[PDB]
Amino acid sequence: ALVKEEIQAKEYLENLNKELAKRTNVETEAAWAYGSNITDENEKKKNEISAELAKFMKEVASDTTKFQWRSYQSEDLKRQFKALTKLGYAALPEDDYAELLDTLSAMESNFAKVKVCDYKDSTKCDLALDPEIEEVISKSRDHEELAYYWREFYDKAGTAVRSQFERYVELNTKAAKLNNFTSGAEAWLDEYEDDTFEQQLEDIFADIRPLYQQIHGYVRFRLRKHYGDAVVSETGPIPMHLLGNMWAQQWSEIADIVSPFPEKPLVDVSAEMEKQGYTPLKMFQMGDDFFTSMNLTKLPQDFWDKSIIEKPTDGRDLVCHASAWDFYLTDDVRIKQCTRVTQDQLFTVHHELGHIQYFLQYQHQPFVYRTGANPGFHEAVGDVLSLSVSTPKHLEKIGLLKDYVRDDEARINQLFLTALDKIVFLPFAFTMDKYRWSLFRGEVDKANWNCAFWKLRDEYSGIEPPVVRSEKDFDAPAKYHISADVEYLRYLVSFIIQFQFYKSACIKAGQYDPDNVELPLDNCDIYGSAAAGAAFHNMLSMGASKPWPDALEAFNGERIMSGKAIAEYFEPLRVWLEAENIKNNVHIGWTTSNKCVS
Amino acid sequence: YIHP
Ligand SMILES: *[C@@H]1O[C@H](CO)[C@@H](O[C@@H]2O[C@H](CO)[C@@H](O[C@@H]3O[C@H](CO[C@H]4O[C@H](CO)[C@@H](O)[C@H](O)[C@@H]4O)[C@@H](O)[C@H](O[C@H]4O[C@H](CO[C@@H]5O[C@H](CO)[C@@H](O)[C@H](O)[C@@H]5O)[C@@H](O)[C@H](O)[C@@H]4O)[C@@H]3O)[C@H](O)[C@H]2NC(C)=O)[C@H](O)[C@H]1NC(C)=O
Ligand SMILES: [Zn+2]
Numbered sequence: 001a002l003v004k005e006e007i008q009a010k011e012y013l014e015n016l017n018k019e020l021a022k023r024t025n026v027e028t029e030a031a032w033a034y035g036s037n038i039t040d041e042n043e044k045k046k047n048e049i050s051a052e053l054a055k056f057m058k059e060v061a062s063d064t065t066k067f068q069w070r071s072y073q074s075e076d077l078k079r080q081f082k083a084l085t086k087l088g089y090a091a092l093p094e095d096d097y098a099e100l101l102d103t104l105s106a107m108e109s110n111f112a113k114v115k116v117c118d119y120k121d122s123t124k125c126d127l128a129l130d131p132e133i134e135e136v137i138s139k140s141r142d143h144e145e146l147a148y149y150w151r152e153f154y155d156k157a158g159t160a161v162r163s164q165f166e167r168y169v170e171l172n173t174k175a176a177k178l179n180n181f182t183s184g185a186e187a188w189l190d191e192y193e194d195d196t197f198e199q200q201l202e203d204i205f206a207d208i209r210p211l212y213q214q215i216h217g218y219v220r221f222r223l224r225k226h227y228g229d230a231v232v233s234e235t236g237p238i239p240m241h242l243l244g245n246m247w248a249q250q251w252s253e254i255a256d257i258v259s260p261f262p263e264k265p266l267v268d269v270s271a272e273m274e275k276q277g278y279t280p281l282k283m284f285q286m287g288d289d290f291f292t293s294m295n296l297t298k299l300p301q302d303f304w305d306k307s308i309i310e311k312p313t314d315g316r317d318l319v320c321h322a323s324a325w326d327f328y329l330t331d332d333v334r335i336k337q338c339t340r341v342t343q344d345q346l347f348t349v350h351h352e353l354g355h356i357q358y359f360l361q362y363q364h365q366p367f368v369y370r371t372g373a374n375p376g377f378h379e380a381v382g383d384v385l386s387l388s389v390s391t392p393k394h395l396e397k398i399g400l401l402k403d404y405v406r407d408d409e410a411r412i413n414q415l416f417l418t419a420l421d422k423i424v425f426l427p428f429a430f431t432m433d434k435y436r437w438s439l440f441r442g443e444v445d446k447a448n449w450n451c452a453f454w455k456l457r458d459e460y461s462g463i464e465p466p467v468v469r470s471e472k473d474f475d476a477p478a479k480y481h482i483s484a485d486v487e488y489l490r491y492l493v494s495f496i497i498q499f500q501f502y503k504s505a506c507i508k509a510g511q512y513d514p515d516n517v518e519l520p521l522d523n524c525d526i527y528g529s530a531a532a533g534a535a536f537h538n539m540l541s542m543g544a545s546k547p548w549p550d551a552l553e554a555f556n557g558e559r560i561m562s563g564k565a566i567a568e569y570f571e572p573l574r575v576w577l578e579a580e581n582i583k584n585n586v587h588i589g590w591t592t593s594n595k596c597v598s
Numbered sequence: 599y600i601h602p
Binding site: 249321322323324325326348351352355378379425429480481484486491494 | 601
């Protein structure tokens with residue numbers, strides 16, 4: 001009978017969760033070793049452990065059918081059993097799973113191993129994306145130099161793995177269908193536990209899109225004054241290599257040439273960080289300080305002993321794309337970051353430490369609940385702190401911003417600088433998964449795969465490649481997450497919900513009042529706030545034990561993902577920018593790009 | 599868990 005079985009099932013879950021944590025620890029260790037030190041030996045080891053764990057997962061999914069779990073009284077037990085039925089890639093036949101793993105590591109290792117030749121010196125061909133190529137993209141204002149580095153990187157990180165990417169799509173689709181999702185798109189979307197999630201995002205994106213259009217138009221206007229009309233047209237998409245980022249995902253690196261008020265202060269603390277002798281260790285210690293100041297959890301000794309916070313100086317290949325790692329024991333959490341002493345990197349440190357804090361907050365939960373309420377929640381945590389860290393308020397406290405006068409013009413500069421990160425990123429993030437969804441769903445013929453990518457980048461972001469591309473090129477995998485098979489919608493969700501978290505944290509901290517001119521949202525610092533920290537504790541400690549609206553409710557009493565908070569943050573900028581574009585007769589919108597030949 |  002069922003009452004006796006449900007008692008038996010509870011004990012089954014308790015043991016199985018612990019077993020899964022321990023087995024995942026072993027896989028995670030091998031994945032960490034490979035990412036920290038890319039070799040054929042470490043690749044083989046990583047993939048073989050994964051194959052072994054996949055086999056065990058198959059038996060787990062099979063064993064769930066021995067329990068009448070859908071009949072149980074406990075919502076908690078049912079939720080745990082449902083999580084265990086979800087096999088993902090592990091649903092694939094043994095041989096197919098091994099091939100997928102080989103395909104995945106081929107793409108990630110290709111990306112990580114990319115090296116290009118110096119623009120000025122064809123002798124020197126050891127320039128990696130991080131830091132050599134990214135240094136040029138962010139700092140050079142030589143448009144032909146920029147175009148050279150763009151072409152070299154995309155050819156090597158993108159085009160080189162076309163055939164591998166094609167097989168990856170095939171096996172991803174096969175895995176999804178074995179789990180009875182239509183495609184990998186539905187498999188990914190399942191993490192949000194909401195059958196209207198795509199529509200919800202379309203609705204939020206549509207509300208914020210007009211503001212992006214205004215920012216786009218103004219940036220294009222300002223770039224025309226810098227580079228001239230031969231380089232930048234008034235009516236066409238912006239040549240993406242001029243935007244200070246390899247993927248044009250955020251434009252803050254060109255703030256010095258596009259800022260609303262160039263005679264007024266623009267916050268860029270990198271030089272002061274260097275002058276004051278900042279190190280990666282110091283930056284991580286400061287991040288730790290921020291969390292503990294909020295009455296949240298101190299980094300454990302294992303973090304300091306085991307993390308990699310600087311790029312290794314030996315010859316070795318590794319993945320430098322910053323990541324945070326949970327090892328599923330107690331207090332074994334780590335970051336791998338090729339840390340540089342810059343303002344942007346100080347934000348990255350806090351972002352990654354946001355993941356770490358989430359790990360620590362839910363490590364007491366059963367294994368299946370030791371993950372984010374949804375993938376967007378995990379990406380949001382550290383960004384909430386980074387929003388505070390970025391304020392003139394906070395940066396003056398820590399002595400990184402000197403002689404700053406916060407008048408109306410300086411406020412617009414700072415709001416615009418933030419928007420160059422936060423608003424600009426939204427269409428970018430949406431396209432990363434719109435693209436992959438369309439391939440997963442079989443909506444694009446293989447003959448049209450590359451221009452389908454650039455079509456989306458044009459349609460949503462109004463950017464284009466510096467040179468003519470065709471179906472001979474394959475540019476999508478030049479973005480880390482695409483080569484590494486990391487879902488990207490999490491970041492769109494994050495950039496929306498992080499403002500919901502920030503607004504509420506600021507209100508709880510007594511740092512934001514919409515009717516008090518002295519407490520604007522865009523200068524809120526939650527440092528030292530135990531009240532803000534309590535909200536984080538309430539939400540993060542839940543892990544994935546409840547559907548995400550319950551996790552949001554625990555933070556601030558709300559249950560709905562909403563664009564209200566992000567729009568509220570940028571409202572003063574919207575008012576000023578709409579008026580400034582009219583004043584300057586700024587053309588808005590763009591013609592269809594000519595940069596991808598069919 | 600990776601950076602954007
Ligand atoms: C993705 O969707 C797939 C469907 O599109 C799905 O695949 C199906 O899974 C079913 C398992 O639940 C499976 O059903 C079994 O079928 C057996 C016979 O099937 C054969 O003939 C079919 C053609 O007629 C072929 O297509 C097949 O390939 C097979 O050759 C049955 O013998 C079997 O029965 C037993 O089990 C039932 C279920 O019992 C349940 O649990 C308790 C017992 O513990 C019961 O008290 C309770 O009432 C409940 O019903 C018993 O009732 C029965 O007495 C037998 O013991 C069973 O019906 C089906 O064959 C399979 N394929 C297809 C094409 O339908 C995948 O599982 C989905 N994948 C995921 C991950 O969800
Ligand atoms: Zn992240």
